[PDB]
Amino acid sequence: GVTDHTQRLSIITKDLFQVAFNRVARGMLHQDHITFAMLLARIKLKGTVGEPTYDAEFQHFLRGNEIVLSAGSTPRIQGLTVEQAEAVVRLSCLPAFKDL
Known about the structure:
It is classed as motor protein. By secondary structure, the protein is mainly alpha-helical. It is 54% helix and 0% strand. The chain has helices at 5-25, 33-47, 55-62, 82-91. The protein starts with a helix and ends in a 9-residue tail after the last helix.
């Protein structure tokens, strides 16, 4: 019942993502469903327009533990434990969270 081609294209793209996720994740363990959902989300983020590439932010999400903290570089922050302290001084390297 759909006649316009742009609406058909949008429906085809969304249904491609949905049917691919359904037919993959039915034969797949429940710990990894969110992983494939995240991969398809990043793929659709790449495909859409009007957005930045989010390369450095996803790099700090994936290999953000690769940031090396210096000896005694963490100051004292109230409430947070040592793991939260090293996490916030690792997040502070990003320009978006510079004043964290």
